[model samples]
Target chain A: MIFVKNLASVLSQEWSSTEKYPGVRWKFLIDADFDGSSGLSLGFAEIAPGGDLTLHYHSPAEIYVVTNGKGILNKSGKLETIKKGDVVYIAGNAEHALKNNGKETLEFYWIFPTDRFSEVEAFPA
Target chain B: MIFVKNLASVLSQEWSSTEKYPGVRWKFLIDADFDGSSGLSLGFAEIAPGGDLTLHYHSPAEIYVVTNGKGILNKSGKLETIKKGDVVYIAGNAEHALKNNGKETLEFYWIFPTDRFSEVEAFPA
Candidate 1:
């Protein structure tokens, strides 16, 4: 399942969002649903200024690599500041969220172990 | 296996280089050897202009998220151009290599499903 995808190829695709994550959107870059690839899934995420990724938890652990701007990460209520060049590893079922308090938009790449994002289940913290 | 690491914290750590990848270096950010993390291993890699990741193959599938500059990907015998914001998926045992033909250094994040980079066995393609 080897494949190469450029951001430009997917930028035209719609970014998906949900009610829990107001002002937040993402586009899948590598996933079984998008490209029939397996083993791992990854996507690009963005949070507009003053927006937040509501508190939630998922059974599968997650990882985030910040690419732009700064934000506050709610690691089960113990907020920690994160900025460009920062990477965070969230344990499975650990409650967490991200808020962009800065004026600029927050951008990052998020990954999950599953083959597809649809396979993971998220619940409110 | 949960933690947050800022690039600044590890910037002082020496980058590892190999004779096969001259002008290329990398620093592990998340791995069993570095942080006792599991499930996946990630590292930041830089290829100075004119440098290349020599052709090689590994049993574990890998991923690369290019962050800066541009380069040419050696996909077996065929070559393809890649640049910033590009993400590549290299299937298990796929012979591939990357070369920075551009003037600026090529920066990217490489990932493996293994818990540590040491677990991966690289062989000449």
Candidate 2:
């Protein structure tokens, strides 16, 4: 049994890019051993009110588990409200963006595989 | 508000490999999107009685949250019993193996990032 462990709070410490975007605060949490030999990762991102992330896409499909707050997922021109305890899968190359419209912070885990580490260019569709 | 979600249950569907060892049964659960760009994955394994996995390690390290069953982890010359709710971290290249010592099945997520997918060989320490 190869056992790797961590508390959700602890994994929230590593931030790759936490810059102020148009409507989002994007933070990366792959600072722990992301040596590029494996094909996946597990981490979180915290988004505050009125914050929205970029409409980006990756090679690997992604999974998101909502930990707290309320937000909106805009994908393929479809908008939906996402709340706590919701899990959604985003297929690779799908046009997706997120917006935190709630009063509190929206935090959730961003689990992607190795196939999504390439250069993510901004494509406005 | 990106949320990747699942019960300790649904992520157990993917099977990269489920080979029977001398004392182990190992399963891979990264079939969702291990495409190799973003960098992370999350899934589970179901280990049965007397099934023991190999002594293996990866560069990205790992985090294991025990979902069910009784298993033993042999890492760093230290052996310990792992139960439900115990999350452990295995650093890169740290020798490790898992065994289902109980009469039931052992199933847990095998989450790896985009860095550990190059030519995984069987090495014993």
Candidate 3:
């Protein structure tokens, strides 16, 4: 009923960036799609200065553990500034976006309830 | 469907140490019991050097995102070394514990799929 895993055990490659998210990149840490984990999926994400995680929405609630730097959180149309040490909770289908408007990179960990990031459809808002 | 929260937004007091965890303390970041969040709860915990998190288990699966220091993880009797960047998944009813055998504090962020940590019963093992 229990198991242990290391972030180093997986994500052996460099960060992965998508064209849709210019200057934003992430690496998966735990997910059922790759590691047999269930009910959760997590990833470490980084946003370069001036990078943008475009406004998007998904069906599942999400959490963001900000580890470093500062950024502006696009909570629907209300923009809120968040910095390192902040943990954000995004309710299901709540459109959101992130932009690193600071001089340093915006680094954080994101968790989703789905088995994989792939299953959490990123619907552009 | 979405709301934003910060670790500094709540948890107004200092670290809370429990009797069962002598040198360990924690602060809750998000939980429905207080913050009105749902689906999940998270907290940041720390174990002083030479401290121990007694072996225990709970019904909800748990995840630990080790952020700093090093220590030994009690994987149901099989001791394993875990350090920063290690993300542990404890299945339901899996008795486990953490020991700060190193010189520095063993710090981590733990998550559970429950509205509040109080809802999850921690049965000592």
Candidate 4:
């Protein structure tokens, strides 16, 4: 039973490297431990302004529960604005990316079903 | 891109196959579509009074976001009461089961990483 009191603290610890993606450090709360190879992992990702997720897709579906801030969701070819409290589901294999468009840092819960994770594709946009 | 307006509706459709569980018909929303073989799926589950989940654990970790109603979380050897907005993380192999103690039906988002799903263990609690 793991409770991320502020979620911000958990993000800092799990994704302190900040090198994988510029301006973004992944704060993985529950990865690998919860789902082993079965592909389930959930985490609080903290992304700063200009922080954009690499275009990618999981063999498994991904769900994003927006906690706060505004971001852009580039799904397939259509892009949409997502705000706090909105839940977005990215179907498996759908090309996608998220950008922190707001001045304030963006944060949300990212969940999917795979530990053998990979961002198979990248979109130039 | 599937949106469950109240989540309760999704549970009703996916879990209409309640015959499997004596008192529970699982409402599986996006079970097979999200993650191909890699095993990622997310859905809203509606369990009713005496609507106890069979003791089970996925090879992948599972996360439960309690939206409404009160339920008992029997995890491993510990049990906790879950309320709305409470996020509970169940490790991949933890023995777990949920029961809707309240008169109203218990509803929540049941997200996990698995297409070949199974409930291997059941405890007489």
Each model's lDDT: 0.88, 0.59, 0.83, 0.61
Q: How do the residues B1-125 of candidate 2 rate in per-residue lDDT, one tens digit apiece? A: 23334443345544445453554333333333443333445555567788777676655666565667878888777888887545555656778888888987876655554433343444566
- The worst-scoring run of ten residues by lDDT in candidate 3 chain B lies at B1-10
What is the per-candidate TM-score for chain B?
0.96, 0.70, 0.92, 0.70
TM-score of chain A of each: 0.96, 0.74, 0.91, 0.74
DockQ of 3: 0.55
What TM-score quantifies how close candidate 1 is to the native fold? 0.94
Task: Evaluate model 4: give its TM-score.
Answer: 0.62
RMSD, candidate 3, Å: 2.2
lDDT of 4 by residue, A1-125 (tens): 43322354353453454454676665555555432433356666767899988666545567787667888888765778887656666766667788887898787777775553343332343
Candidate 2 lDDT, A8-122, residue by residue in tens: 4355444445353654433443433542323344555678798877677655666665668989988667888887755566766777888899999987766665423333344
State how far residue A64 of model 2 sits from its true place (Å).
1.8
- Give each prediction's DockQ, rounded to 2 decimals: 0.62, 0.22, 0.55, 0.27
Count of clashing pairs, candidate 3: 1
Q: Candidate 3 residues A2-115, lDDT tens each? A: 555554575465778999999999887777756777776788899999999999998887889888999999989999999877788887788999999999999988987666
lDDT of 3 by residue, B1-125 (tens): 45555546655757778898778998888778667877768888889999999999988778888889999999899998999867787777889999999999899988887778899889999
Give the share of true interchain contacts found in each model. 0.60, 0.34, 0.56, 0.33
**What is the Å distance of residue B107 in model 4 from its true position?**
4.1
Q: Chain A TM-score, candidate 1?
A: 0.96
Interface RMSD of each: 1.7, 6.2, 2.3, 4.5
